Amino acid sequence: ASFVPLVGDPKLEGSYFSWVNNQPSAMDDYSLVKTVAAIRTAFGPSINRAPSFKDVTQLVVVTRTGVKHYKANDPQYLRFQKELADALQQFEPSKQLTLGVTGLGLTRDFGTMYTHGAVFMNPTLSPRVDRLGETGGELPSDYMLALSIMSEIYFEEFKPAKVRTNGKSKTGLPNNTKDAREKKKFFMSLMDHGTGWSSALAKGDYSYSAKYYGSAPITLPTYRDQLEKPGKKRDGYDFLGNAVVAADKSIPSKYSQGVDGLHALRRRTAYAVSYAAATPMQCFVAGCRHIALERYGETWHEHDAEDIIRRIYKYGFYELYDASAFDTGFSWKEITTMIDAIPGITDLARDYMRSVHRLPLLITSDVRGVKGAYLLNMDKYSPGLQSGVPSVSDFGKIRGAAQWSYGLMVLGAIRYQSRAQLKTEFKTLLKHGRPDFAMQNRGDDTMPLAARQKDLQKWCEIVEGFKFCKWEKDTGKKFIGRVLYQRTPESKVVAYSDIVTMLEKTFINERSMFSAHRPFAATGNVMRYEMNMAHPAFGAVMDVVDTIMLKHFGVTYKECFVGAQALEKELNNGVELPDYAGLNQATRDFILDPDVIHYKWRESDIDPRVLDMVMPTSLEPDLCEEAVHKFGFVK
Ligand SMILES: [Ca+2]
């Protein structure tokens, strides 16, 4: 009972079907029918719909006479986008000085600006269960030791912390509501079950979850759109299991509106783990995250752009590396090694955290026009690092630093005689106590630091040769979203935000302006304008933008969004965000992208006034402390 047809009665590929049949069914017929009825009661349209295209409002023009919404598929907006993209081709990636790019702070041209804001590629590359978690090369014993020690350091101390859940997100199953009031009542009821709920999920007994809440905890694969360079080919798998070599990026005539030269959006696959399964794990994970990012903030955290540059000049030489398929090559052997290394949690907590990583998947269609869906009753499979797991940002920070700390063990700078001493020399490296080596890591983004340039080249040569992970030099020289700029070889190095990203998140956005995910779109575009005024490439790029903005809309960049601020405040029931002068940069970046707290800043770094308006639910530290004990996780 592993494969469950749901909508179009799809037929998987043989290599996939014969493998799924050999896998034992995750749920018995009692819980399966109870769950199938729940994924049909809810997700009615989402399960029976075809991909088609997107309905996104990209620009809202406020005039004395009227207000016009320009969508991504509007013909007048596509002619503006085509002309602005052509007018921005005069810019090219600038030269890189010893310690950063110079001249115009451009790490890439405005090429992605040809991406059609409403059309995504077909087929949207979908995950494949039997080919996930592949490491390729063997995992060394010294690396698995460093990975266990890095995880032990990260989850060494637990201090109950405030857990906020996005009010724009669903709860999945069993309970399915965006309501903030229902989300907390649903968690209080889960506390009353406590060990009975945790033991059922830790044993793969999804019948208990269906007895009291009507369904079983499943993970829903969601979509996250992205812009793409022209001529980029995407290879992957089909939602039936077939293999796609070159995902079609062409724009159909109904959507191109005659505007040639455009290509389609890349649609990445995300995961939406059940709120019932993720939240109890989040109540413990959040308690250790705010400690790890504070004790060892020299590696995994930051307070402002001036902390990165200061750590750079403390050692002298740096490089920038990105991990190729970091979440895809996340083997299950590495996950359990990190889970088993966590001190303070019971064996019930370890088995509970494993089941959250690999919940049964409800696969939906990606082929354009083909409406179909099925439920993979899979409990024991290598899932990689699903983006919905509460510990995705923390396991990424652990594995990334453990792979570079293993490179120093191969290099010989870190020689180990015991676990207790290796844990100590790792703590010193993380706190940047070593005078010769350090690093700044944020998952798949790592900047190794060294006092001698030849020491850094040897260290980077080692991690590139690793076969269990692909580390490649970042050609863009961006860390997080920070461009490293150096005016002249004599001037100091300054960090700037990429100006290409400003126009990306303004004219080719993922979600509509003033929508549920972007309630402060006008004010958010104003902050990007004022922030990037000091950017070296601000005068040249905005002279081009304002020229094309006036030619098609009769309003400049700042005029367009300052006038829309009056419309924004009215649409949000007079709710006025506090002026950015009183907010920190963490709150600033959280206003632009609400999904910043999940990858960059902490929940305690956001101002409480702004944090309450976006995140309605909030589990207090005393409620999390009661939960982690009631569920039976803490020893
Ligand atoms: Ca980078």
Q: What is the DSSP string of 249-289?
A: ----HHHHTT--S-EEEEEEEEEE--HHHHHHHHHHHHHHH
The 3-state DSSP class for residue 345 equals strand
Residue with token string 């402060």: 520
Q: Strands 263-272, 115-120: parallel, antiparallel or unpaired by DSSP?
A: parallel
Question: Can you list the pairs that 49-52 forms with residues at least 24 positions away whose Cβ atoms lie under 8 Å?
Answer: 49/371, 50/365, 50/368, 50/369, 50/370, 50/371, 51/120, 51/122, 51/124, 51/365, 51/366, 51/367, 51/368, 51/369, 52/368, 52/369
Ligand 1 centroid from CA 224, angstroms: 20
Residue 562 within a domain:
no
DSSP 497-557: E-HHHHHHHHHS-SS-TTSSS-TTHHHHHHHHHHHGGGSTTHHHHHHHHHHHHHHHHSS-H
Torsion from C-alpha of 217, 221, 225, 228, nearest 10 degrees = 140
Q: Which two tokens stand for residue 356?
A: 């959250």
Q: Is 474 exposed, middle or buried (0-12, 13-18, 19+ CB in 10 A)?
A: middle
Ligand 1 centroid from CA 312, angstroms: 15
Q: Which two tokens stand for residue 601?
A: 């800043």
H or E segment and range at residue 374: strand 373-376
Ligand 1 centroid from CA 64, angstroms: 44
Ligand 1 centroid from CA 300, angstroms: 14
307 carries a ligand binding annotation: no
Burial per residue of 193-231, b for 16 or more beta-carbon CB atoms within 10 angstroms, e otherwise = bbeebbbbbbebbbbbbbeebbbbbbbbbbbebebbeee
Integer angstrom CA distances of residue 248 from 123, 292, 373:
7, 43, 22
Ligand 1 centroid from CA 299, angstroms: 15
Ligand 1 centroid from CA 445, angstroms: 5
Residue 287 within a domain:
yes
Ligand 1 centroid from CA 268, angstroms: 19
Cβ within 8 Å of residue 536, ≥6 positions away: 103, 104, 105, 485, 487, 496
Query: Distance between CA 604 and CA 617 in Å, rounded?
Result: 15
Residue 360 within a domain:
yes
543 carries a ligand binding annotation: no
Residue 124 within a domain:
no
Q: Are 329 and 452 in contact (CB under 8 A)?
A: no
Residue 335 within a domain:
yes
Ligand 1 centroid from CA 446, angstroms: 7
Ligand 1 centroid from CA 239, angstroms: 30
Which is it for the CA torsion 604, 180, 55, 374, positive or negative? positive
Q: How many domains does the chain have?
A: 1
Ligand 1 centroid from CA 441, angstroms: 10
445 carries a ligand binding annotation: yes
Ligand 1 centroid from CA 218, angstroms: 33
Nearest to 540 by CA among 113, 115, 110: 110
The 3-state DSSP class for residue 601 equals coil
Query: Distance between CA 391 and CA 455 in Å, rounded?
Result: 33
478 carries a ligand binding annotation: yes
DSSP state of 219: B
Residue 136 within a domain:
yes
Which is it for the CA torsion 305, 309, 314, 319, positive or negative? positive
Query: Distance between CA 605 and CA 609 in Å, rounded?
Result: 12
Q: Provide the domain limits for residue 281.
A: 3-46+131-475+590-630
Ligand 1 centroid from CA 479, angstroms: 4
Ligand 1 centroid from CA 444, angstroms: 8
Nearest to 275 by CA among 357, 380, 183: 183
How was this structure obtained?
Answer: X-ray
Nearest to 441 by CA among 525, 557, 318, 614: 318
Residue 282 within a domain:
yes
Integer angstrom CA distances of residue 80 from 113, 508, 525, 554:
11, 12, 18, 12
474 carries a ligand binding annotation: yes
Terminus-to-terminus CA distance in the chain, angstroms?
A: 37
Ligand 1 centroid from CA 600, angstroms: 13
Query: Distance between CA 346 and CA 343 in Å, rounded?
Result: 9
Resolution stated for this PDB structure, in Å: 3.0
Residue 359 within a domain:
yes
Q: Which two tokens stand for residue 391?
A: 């510990």
Nearest to 103 by CA among 529, 538, 482, 543: 538
